[PDB]
Amino acid sequence: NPFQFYLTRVSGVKPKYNSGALHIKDILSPLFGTLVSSAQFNYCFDVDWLVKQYPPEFRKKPILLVHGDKREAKAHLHAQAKPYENISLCQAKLDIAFGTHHTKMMLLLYEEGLRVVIHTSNLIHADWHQKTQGIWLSPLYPRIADGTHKSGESPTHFKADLISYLMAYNAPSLKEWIDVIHKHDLSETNVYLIGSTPGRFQGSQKDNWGHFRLKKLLKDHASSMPNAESWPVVGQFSSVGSLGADESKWLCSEFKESMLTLGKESSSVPLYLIYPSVENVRTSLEGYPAGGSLPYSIQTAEKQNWLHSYFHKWSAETSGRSNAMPHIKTYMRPSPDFSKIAWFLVTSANLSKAAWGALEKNGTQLMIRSYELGVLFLPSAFGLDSFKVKQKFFAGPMATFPVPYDLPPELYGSKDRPWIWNIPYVKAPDTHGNMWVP
Ligand SMILES: O=C(O)c1cnc2ccccc2c1O
16 A cells, blocks of 8 residues: 555454554564654653553663643653653643644654654553554655755655644754754655644745645645535544534634635535544443543533534444544545545544634634644545545555545434533443443
């Protein structure tokens, strides 16, 4: 496959559903390269667990943890890492309230080159155990010979765009990694980088991040087809922010408008949102504790009951993962019969203004609170007009894209409710025999 899109291993499915999945131990294995140094961008860390995932012979190589924690949380993280002399930390600045550092990325510097991994999992045991998570693996990028002058750039501008993303941190430990990236040839990259960084962007910077970045890429590198208004938009996520009192405030005005862009020319497009129901969580491999990682609060939800009429159940028979709750986030544009897609995005970004940005100042400024990162698969980047949807995720056709959940998505039933993490569920017990009492 050209796509290099993987799911994480799930404990408890049959081996045919883990063949071609990756555990973190597989990613860090010496088979992938001889590690010299690594950077782990993430949100939540279990440092003891993390060091155990590196091969024994690599466990004292330098590791940089890039995080967003402040005050006592920051103290706790430093305390976790102090036993390990080879671990340094970088606190990403979060100068806008209610922002977080959500980006999940590994930079892996080898003897043989450089690899970039953009994924959706926290660096804790439970995120790699029984959840549906996504991984994009870069090629092995070779070093550019000392004295050679070449750009090392791809047709998707990935090298410049990744450096731009790192420059936004304004951090000395990441200037070191920027210089590493400058020294390597990333020209084989066939995905586009879509990042969010905190700030207020106007003018020439408006298109750099968030949903305006997506819109710009779709305008420039995708084509509109006849009956484009019939091609749905699908969003699939593990948390929802406060989106406003009705759909016109943000979801179906600026967000959907960005996601329905195709081509350069100037809505009733169906919008499917996939988010686990209470019954999805109850009957999951983890049971109700899976809801610990689906943090939709009742305070937020009761302000926007209009939203839930868009919600569809989690179902993933195609990858044997209907009972492995999603922490992956994906967005895509299928054809009306769900047999093709015009593009696919895997990202850390949930369905929130904090992650995707919200227009301010009379439409002239895009304000983003958080760090997020994902990669966009466009048919043009692969010499194609569209992607065929792979019928079984782990089956085997070569330019068919592996969509990890079932299509068409299934609407909530009248008795279903969206998983809301801070109210009790005591009517029916979960797969481990327990109720949920927050
Ligand atoms: O990975 C993330 O982006 C993230 C961020 N905040 C979270 C808050 C509660 C539970 C899970 C969370 C999570 O999984």
